[PDB]
Symmetry: C2
Subunit: 181 residues, 2 copies
């Protein structure tokens, strides 16, 4: 990306000081979604990064993930595979648990959606702890998918997510870096 | 408009699951269309072609399956995408509308700043069933001064009365794949 493209994307994102709490600056991708140029540019740069990488499927987690994975799948000309909250997918699934503050949640994937020989790109809005992406990489590999790549609009470089994913053999590509926890 | 062959390709791309989510029902599963790059691209390209001269200034999609169809149509039209979300997910000032579900009610929210007077909105969703969520979405759009006359769907469950419900709001529905049942 050019410095002009990267600053336009940074400037398209609203930061809500002390949302959802004091000291937390929420990075709001909805202002990017509503801007024709910023949204298109975010998708075009991700497609350009992966066009030669032999990607055969794009995975996006529910729900903001869908907004960036699905357009990147269409731009690469490959299928889109949703990873969802429990009880929403209708065919055979597998499930992975990830930790939150005061408990856990689960993500599910269709078992038939990823096959051995598939090379998968994960795409999400924002890299924070990386917990959800770590669980998504576990789902993909349980299905025999190869995954080495995760792409983000925003990376919160203070929260350790990139290094967490590197422990799984994931290289992260992020358009907009922001500080804050 | 869409060719008969294109419509048959889209209809054949959608899996039907016997006795899900309850016995005697045939669940129309759009995830098989998402997985097929030809069917997914064809669906998006057709919806963009249908509305390319309609003066659309914004596309609205409801969480979550709606995002998979409305956001690519927004990019094809080269207009902004505005999500309508389940409560407590949008971080800035919202308004809310209540709608009916099988076992009660729930709300959808929109950012108050996302639609303005002069906006002409296309609503895009995966599937037209009762139409309750789209009815609520149309109310949100019009509360903000947006015009909305058009909703587009991948699937229309024509037995469930959705299209006629949306006609009572002045909405014309366009759907790619009709199915009987629920
Ligand atoms: Cl949001
Ligand atoms: Cl509906």
């Amino acid at each position: 990306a050019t410095a002009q493209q990267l600053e336009y994307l940074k400037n398209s994102i609203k930061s809500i000081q002390d949302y959802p709490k004091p000291g937390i600056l929420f990075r709001d991708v909805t202002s990017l979604l509503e801007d024709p140029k910023a949204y298109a540019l975010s998708i075009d740069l991700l497609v350009e990064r992966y066009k030669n990488a032999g990607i055969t499927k794009v995975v996006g987690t529910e729900a903001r993930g869908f907004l960036f994975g699905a357009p990147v799948a269409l731009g690469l000309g490959v299928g889109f595979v949703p990873v969802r909250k429990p009880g929403k997918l209708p065919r055979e699934t597998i499930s992975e648990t990830y930790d939150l503050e005061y408990g856990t949640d689960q993500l599910e994937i269709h078992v038939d959606a990823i096959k051995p020989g598939d090379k998968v790109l994960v795409v999400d809005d924002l890299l924070a702890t990386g917990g959800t992406i770590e669980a998504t990489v576990k789902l993909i590999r349980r299905l025999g998918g190869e995954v080495a790549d995760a792409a983000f609009i925003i990376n919160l470089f203070d929260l350790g997510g990139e290094q967490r994913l590197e422990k799984q053999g994931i290289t992260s590509y992020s358009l907009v870096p922001f500080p804050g926890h």
